Amino acid sequence: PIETVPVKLKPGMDGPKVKQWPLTEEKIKALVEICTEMEKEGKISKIGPENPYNTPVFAIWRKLVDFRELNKRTQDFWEVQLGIPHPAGIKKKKSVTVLDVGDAYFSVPLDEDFRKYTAFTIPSINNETPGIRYQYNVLPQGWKGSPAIFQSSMTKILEPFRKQNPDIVIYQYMDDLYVGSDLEIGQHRTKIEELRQHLLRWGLTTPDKKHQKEPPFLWMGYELHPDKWTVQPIVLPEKDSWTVNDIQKLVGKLNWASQIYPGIKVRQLCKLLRGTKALTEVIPLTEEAELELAENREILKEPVHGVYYDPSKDLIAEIQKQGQGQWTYQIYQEPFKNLKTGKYARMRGAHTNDVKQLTEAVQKITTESIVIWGKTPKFKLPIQKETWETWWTEYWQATWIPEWEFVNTPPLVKLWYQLEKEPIVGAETFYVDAGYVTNRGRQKVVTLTDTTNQKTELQAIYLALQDSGLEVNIVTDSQYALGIIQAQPDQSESELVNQIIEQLIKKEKVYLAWVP
Amino acid sequence: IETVPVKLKPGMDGPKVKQWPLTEEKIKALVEICTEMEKEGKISKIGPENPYNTPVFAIKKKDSTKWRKLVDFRELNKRTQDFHPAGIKKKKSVTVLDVGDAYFSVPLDEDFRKYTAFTIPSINNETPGIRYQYNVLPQGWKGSPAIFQSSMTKILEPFRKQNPDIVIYQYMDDLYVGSDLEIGQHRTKIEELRQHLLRWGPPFLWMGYELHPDKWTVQPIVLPEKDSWTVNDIQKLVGKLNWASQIYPGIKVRQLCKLLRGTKALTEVIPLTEEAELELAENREILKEPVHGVYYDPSKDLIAEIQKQGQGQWTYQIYQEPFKNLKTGKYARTNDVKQLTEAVQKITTESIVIWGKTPKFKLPIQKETWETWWTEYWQATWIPEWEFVNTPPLVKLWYQ
Ligand SMILES: CC[C@H]1C(=O)Nc2ccc(F)cc2N1C(=O)OC(C)C
């Protein structure tokens, strides 16, 4: 049959020795049947009273064995599964069949040397009587390594059939097995029955044609067809009063949609969460919140389908600014034939600019794509080479964007201002420190309250901008402030900053310098 | 032929490093490669009982269209138990050789193999991804040089005594060959070596190019030498000066800071009084040479920081204690990332040559970017330790 995977207990630790809690004669009975059957099948075997190990068993009938102690003392296995494929990455198929694999673990041997640790005990109805000792010969449901080992096996069992049927695709996920091809309806169905046999020859039983689930396929929050994909039904509650919990659950749900339903916005809603004091607290919806919700339920009213990856065609990514710190994008191969869409709202760092953010968007997408299509898409961006170039060659950190083409789809990202690379001639010079003193004799000492050494160094500068003319030279000692402005941000969490940014955008020329 | 008992450092366990996702182009390479290494028993598929993992990547080579498999044993080497001619640096020329294939003959301790577990990922997780483990000595693993050292000596011993005018230094998978011969004769002699290797069963690292250590002079600090000096210029002057005073404490600004008397207009042109003139000159004279008293100690980590000077120009510095620079340099000439990789590599290769160890880097780049493109340009067989940072404003000014 199949190759036994050698297992071992964690170093030093020893097998479990936890006693079997008490059991109803009713339950003893039922268990002895279950076990005698399991012993006939060979999954377990009676052992000598010399085996000092034991794992509890209770009944649901159904035999339920508590392996947590053993699991705690069992070696770590190779992770059962990090990522799951994402629809946008899969290919179109003429037929897709899902195969349930009943009693998977029961059909797989267990490292012989390990078996002794799986020992459990069936109480004797008569108390004068000693109970029966058993141990497993196969993967015990509920045991640490069953998943990993089962899957491992499955692969080997599949490798062959896979070689002989390269024109067939198989994805294993837990106990389900997905098989697809582009064979005519009938030939397809025959391989399925070929495979089912293959599995059966390894004792693996599968569901009869009349019984297997039929597409759409509800998988990991999706709904798969063999030609197109989407996300399962999505209904927004119509309701008079909303509770933070309601709000939170709702926003959460809306995000899920963003991956295929473009135009979804949660701004106003997320906003309702500010200052909240309890999950059960009711929050009334602002006018804009209502607006946003209605618009969303509108988008969700009509189903939209994602299409499958055609590895023959290029991947194209397009990004848009859908609000301050908000970006939308959609990857397609066939013109507007979406494979997937999405948003990006991440502002990494307290301050930034569209150029910097647009680029961070590109990096997420780049990473996503490699993961899904194993390649990066040609990007279509609302920023001009020059603009980027300029910001690029002047920024201290390094960065690189793959091949991308400018798309004149407003709003086009740009930099709202630039610091002169040189002090300005004929522009007043302000020395800040909370106030300033200028070369032209002016001064404005203003004492601020509830400030920070940093927000204060920022204040000075601001004042200076305000009171200065269209062109100004500013000398500060704050390395901090310097870095911030020097970075040419166009948006910040700090209002002061935004006040300053506003100031800066207005000036004709601004030169900021630093001194100790 | 028996193996050599190798253990991890006491108490340590194996690496379980996550596999950064790869481009199906790099994955395909890896598959082809590992399939073959398998046929030749170099590696073997492993089961679930192995929970360990190290990252693999595929990189290109110089003068070849064949892909090279790189395995990030950085963590593994850090958990591997423990076990340099100051002349190499003085040599006119040094050519780097990839002798990594040497190891593929010596078997690896049966009980250590499980630790070399690596994974070839699959696109979109459409399959569990092939898992492997080493049977022979792996390239990039801290122990292979060691374990193979013996055999390596026997293999070199001849050429060693025959060509004593050369300096052969080995590091990880690389062999550094040094000489002062005229370049022409050099390239010819390198060959005789690699065939004296074929003799025992070997690519040009970097190009078929040679480094010239004799001229890796430290980039000192400099000051703007200009005609007229404006208030701004003076301020920048003083700023850079003060900073540098931390290192060379003989720097005096007193006089220059006197020119900055009051609130003058930035563009106002300030004449330099003698007191000031002789001050700058003196300050200027001090910087002509790196500070005295900076010695390297094997005992400490080698740190390296790179600054982007824009325009395709970069600046780095190698130290162990801050301000205490062992070396400093430049790099110019493509996109940001491509350059940075070339640089790191350049700085690393340099470290190996000078001190026989890789430095720890600080890269002015967002991690996801690095992770995404570095392999697209990497060519070295080793991998320095690195961390990503945010280059302060002034640090870049004061340099270059
Ligand atoms: C087996 C074929 C494979 C594929 O290439 N396209 C489709 C299309 C429709 C489906 F319902 C499934 C899948 N496939 C897949 O891997 O589905 C997992 C996400 C469950």
Measured from the Cβ of residue A298, the count of other Cβ atoms closer than 10 Å reads 11
β-pairing, A44-46 vs A132-136, is antiparallel
Q: Return the sign of the alpha-carbon dihedral for residues B58, B63, B66, B68.
A: negative
Please report which helix (H) or strand (E) contains residue A255, including its range. helix A244-258
**Both B244 and B291 in a single domain?**
yes
Question: Could you say which residues from 181 to 240 on chain A have a Cβ atom under 8 Å away from some Cβ of chain B?
Answer: none
Q: Name B11's Cβ contacts closer than 8 Å, sequence gap at least 6.
A: none
> How far apart, in Å, are the Cα atoms of B196 and each of B154, B155, B170, B188?
12, 8, 16, 13
Give, for ligand 1, the residue of A178, A188, A372 to mutate: max count of ligand atoms closer than 8 Å to Cβ. Answer: A178
Phi (first) and psi of residue A12, to 5 degrees: 80, -45
**Both B9 and B114 in a single domain?**
yes
Q: How many distinct structural domains can be found in chain A? A: 5
> How far apart, in Å, are the Cα atoms of A246 and each of A9, A243, A278, A396?
46, 5, 12, 44
Which residue in the set A152, A360, A395 is minimally distant from B48, CB to CB?
A152
CB-CB contact of A359 with A353 (8 Å): no
Q: Which of A257, A274, A309 is the last residue of a domain?
A: A309
Q: Which of A279, A309, A339 is the last residue of a domain?
A: A309
Residue B227 CA to ligand 1 center (angstroms) comes to 72
Which pair of tokens denotes residue A217?
């396929």
Give, for ligand 1, the residue of A96, A161, A188, A227 to mutate: max count of ligand atoms closer than 8 Å to Cβ. Answer: A96
**Both A473 and A434 in a single domain?**
yes
Give, for ligand 1, the residue of A158, A161, A170, A171 to mutate: max count of ligand atoms closer than 8 Å to Cβ. Answer: A171
Query: Which residues form the domain of B342?
Result: 296-400
Q: Do B336 and A392 touch (CB under 8 A)?
A: yes
Across the beta sheet with B360-363, the strand order is: B324-332, B313-321, B303-310, B360-363, B385-388
CA atoms of A275 and B387, how far apart (whole Å):
38
Q: Which of B235, B263, B295 is the last residue of a domain?
A: B295
Helix, strand, or coil (residue A242) = strand
Atom of ligand 1 nearest to the CA of A91: 5
Atom of ligand 1 nearest to the CA of A87: 19
Q: For residue B396, which residues of chain A lie inside 8 Å, CB to CB?
A: 396
**Both A128 and A31 in a single domain?**
yes
Separation of CA A66 from chain center: 32
Residue A303 CA to ligand 1 center (angstroms) comes to 20
**Both A94 and A155 in a single domain?**
yes
Which residue in the set A77, A348, A371 is minimally distant from B48, CB to CB?
A77
> How far apart, in Å, are the Cα atoms of B43 and each of A360, A500, B34, B142, B383?
39, 61, 8, 18, 22
CA atoms of A160 and A154, how far apart (whole Å):
11
Residue A216: asked if its preceding bond is cis (omega within 30°), the reply is: yes
Helix, strand, or coil (residue B37) = helix
**Both B160 and B240 in a single domain?**
no
Instruction: For ligand 1, say whether the CB of A406 is within 6 Å of any of its atoms.
Output: no
CA atoms of A511 and B4, how far apart (whole Å):
66
Q: Name B254's Cβ contacts closer than 8 Å, sequence gap at least 6.
A: B279
**Feature table: binding site of A for Mg(2+):** 100, 175-176, 433, 457, 477
Residue A355 CA to ligand 1 center (angstroms) comes to 37
Which pair of tokens denotes residue B375?
């392999």
Domain of B186, CATH number, reads: 3.30.70.270
**Both B88 and B167 in a single domain?**
yes
CA atoms of B88 and B170, how far apart (whole Å):
11
Interface test with B, best of A370, A389, A395 (most B CBs within 10 A): A370
**Feature table: binding site of B:** 98, 173-174
Q: Say if B324 is an interface residue toward chain A (CB within 8 Å).
A: no
**Both B76 and B126 in a single domain?**
yes
Which pair of tokens denotes residue A312?
């023959």
User: Which amino acid is it at A70?
Assistant: L
Measured from the Cβ of residue A163, the count of other Cβ atoms closer than 10 Å reads 8
Instruction: For ligand 1, say whether the CB of A93 is within 6 Å of any of its atoms.
Output: yes
Instruction: For ligand 1, say whether the CB of A53 is within 6 Å of any of its atoms.
Output: no
**Both A95 and A169 in a single domain?**
yes
DSSP string, A129-147: SPPEEEEESBPPTT-TTHH
**Both B89 and B188 in a single domain?**
yes
Q: How many distinct structural domains can be found in chain B? A: 4
Q: Say if A340 is an interface residue toward chain B (CB within 8 Å).
A: no
β-pairing, A404-406 vs A429-432, is unpaired
End-to-end Cα separation, chain B, in angstroms: 56
**Both B57 and B190 in a single domain?**
no
**Both A4 and A133 in a single domain?**
yes
Which pair of tokens denotes residue A21?
């809690």
Phi (first) and psi of residue A27, to 5 degrees: -70, -35
Instruction: For ligand 1, say whether the CB of A99 is within 6 Å of any of its atoms.
Output: no
Domain of A138, CATH number, reads: 3.10.10.10
Burial of A312 from C-beta contacts in 10 A (0-12 / 13-18 / 19+)? exposed
Residue A465 CA to ligand 1 center (angstroms) comes to 60
Which pair of tokens denotes residue A147?
């998943």
Q: Say if B311 is an interface residue toward chain A (CB within 8 Å).
A: yes
Q: Say if A513 is an interface residue toward chain B (CB within 8 Å).
A: yes
CA atoms of A513 and B377, how far apart (whole Å):
38
Question: Count of A–B CB contacts within 8 Å?
Answer: 172
CA atoms of B67 and B55, how far apart (whole Å):
16
CA atoms of A348 and B63, how far apart (whole Å):
41
Helix, strand, or coil (residue A389) = helix
β-pairing, A471-476 vs A429-432, is parallel
CB-CB contact of A369 with A118 (8 Å): no
**Both A382 and A423 in a single domain?**
no
Q: Name A60's Cβ contacts closer than 8 Å, sequence gap at least 6.
A: none
Q: Say if B263 is an interface residue toward chain A (CB within 8 Å).
A: yes
A36-74 CB burial, b ≥16 within 10 A, e <16: eebbeeebbeebeeebebbbbbbbeeebebbbebbeebb
A399-412 CB burial, b ≥16 within 10 A, e <16: bbbeebebeeeeee
**Both A22 and A151 in a single domain?**
no
Residue A200 CA to ligand 1 center (angstroms) comes to 23
Which pair of tokens denotes residue B82?
């423990």
**Both A205 and A221 in a single domain?**
no
Atom of ligand 1 nearest to the CA of A224: 11
Q: Do B392 and A479 touch (CB under 8 A)?
A: yes
CB-CB contact of B80 with B141 (8 Å): yes
Q: Name A313's Cβ contacts closer than 8 Å, sequence gap at least 6.
A: A333, A334
β-pairing, A132-136 vs A120-122, is antiparallel
**Both A10 and A118 in a single domain?**
yes
**Both B241 and B157 in a single domain?**
no
**Both A243 and A189 in a single domain?**
no
Instruction: For ligand 1, say whether the CB of A388 is within 6 Å of any of its atoms.
Output: no
CA atoms of B193 and B159, how far apart (whole Å):
7
Q: Name A12's Cβ contacts closer than 8 Å, sequence gap at least 6.
A: none
DSSP state of A21: P
Q: For residue B372, which residues of chain A lie inside 8 Å, CB to CB?
A: 363, 366-367, 370
**Both A226 and A290 in a single domain?**
yes
β-pairing, A316-321 vs A378-381, is parallel
Q: Which residue has the tokens 């994974």?
A: B119
Give, for ligand 1, the residue of A90, A99, A232 to mutate: max count of ligand atoms closer than 8 Å to Cβ. Answer: A90
Hey, whose CA ends up nearest to atom 18 of ligand 1?
Answer: A171
Q: Which of A120, A146, A172 is the last residue of a domain?
A: A146
Q: Do B263 and A366 touch (CB under 8 A)?
A: no
**Both B129 and B205 in a single domain?**
no
Residue B123 CA to ligand 1 center (angstroms) comes to 13
Instruction: For ligand 1, say whether the CB of A91 is within 6 Å of any of its atoms.
Output: yes
Q: Which residue has the tokens 């963003």?
A: A258
Q: For residue B22, which residues of chain A lie inside 8 Å, CB to CB?
A: 370, 374
Which of A56, A67, A72, A65 has the alpha carbon at shortest distance from A13? A72
CB-CB contact of A371 with B21 (8 Å): yes
CB-CB contact of A238 with A227 (8 Å): no
For chain A, the helix, strand and coil percentages under 3-state DSSP, each to the nearest 5: 35, 20, 45
Residue A172 CA to ligand 1 center (angstroms) comes to 10
Which pair of tokens denotes residue B287?
């910087």
Phi (first) and psi of residue A285, to 5 degrees: -85, 125
Of the CA atoms within 13 Å of residue A211, those in its CB half-sphere come to 9
Q: Do A393 and B311 touch (CB under 8 A)?
A: yes
CA atoms of A450 and A199, how far apart (whole Å):
72
Domain of B5, CATH number, reads: 3.10.10.10
Q: Which of B220, B240, B265 is the last residue of a domain?
A: B220
Domain of A389, CATH number, reads: 3.30.70.270
Measured from the Cβ of residue A227, the count of other Cβ atoms closer than 10 Å reads 13
Question: Could you say which residues from 61 to 80 on chain A have a Cβ atom under 8 Å away from some Cβ of chain B?
Answer: 75-79
**Both B314 and B366 in a single domain?**
yes
Atom of ligand 1 nearest to the CA of A217: 11
Q: Do B264 and A152 touch (CB under 8 A)?
A: no
**Both B122 and B154 in a single domain?**
no
CA atoms of B329 and B399, how far apart (whole Å):
10
Which of A311, A352, A347, A307 has the alpha carbon at shortest distance from A330? A307
Q: Do B25 and A82 touch (CB under 8 A)?
A: no
Which residue in the set A366, A372, A394 is minimally distant from B310, CB to CB?
A394
CA atoms of B151 and A477, how far apart (whole Å):
62
Atom of ligand 1 nearest to the CA of A226: 9
Q: Which residue has the tokens 């740190």?
A: B303
Q: Do B236 and A424 touch (CB under 8 A)?
A: no
CA atoms of B257 and B275, how far apart (whole Å):
11
Q: Say if B265 is an interface residue toward chain A (CB within 8 Å).
A: yes
CB-CB contact of A209 with A193 (8 Å): yes
Which of A246, A245, A244 has the alpha carbon at shortest distance from A236? A246
The strand ranges marked E within chain B are 43-45, 56-61, 64-71, 93-98, 118-120, 130-134, 167-171, 174-179, 204-211, 229-230, 269-270, 303-310, 313-321, 324-332, 360-363, 385-388
Q: For residue B263, which residues of chain A lie inside 8 Å, CB to CB?
A: 429, 431, 437-439
Instruction: For ligand 1, say whether the CB of A176 is within 6 Å of any of its atoms.
Output: no
CA atoms of B378 and B374, how far apart (whole Å):
6
Q: Which of B232, B262, B295 is the last residue of a domain?
A: B295
**Both B287 and B388 in a single domain?**
no
Instruction: For ligand 1, say whether the CB of A511 is within 6 Å of any of its atoms.
Output: no
Q: Say if B332 is an interface residue toward chain A (CB within 8 Å).
A: no
Burial of A451 from C-beta contacts in 10 A (0-12 / 13-18 / 19+)? middle
Query: Which residues form the domain of A437?
Result: 417-513
Which pair of tokens denotes residue A167?
């024109």
* Method by which this entry was solved: X-ray
Which pair of tokens denotes residue B349?
């290769």
Which of A155, A118, A152 has the alpha carbon at shortest distance from A137? A118
**Both A92 and A197 in a single domain?**
yes
Tell which phi-psi region holds residue B41, choosing left (phi > 0), alpha (psi between -120 and 50) or beta.
Answer: left
Q: Say if A336 is an interface residue toward chain B (CB within 8 Å).
A: no
Across the beta sheet with A132-136, the strand order is: A44-46, A132-136, A120-122
Q: Say if A478 is an interface residue toward chain B (CB within 8 Å).
A: no
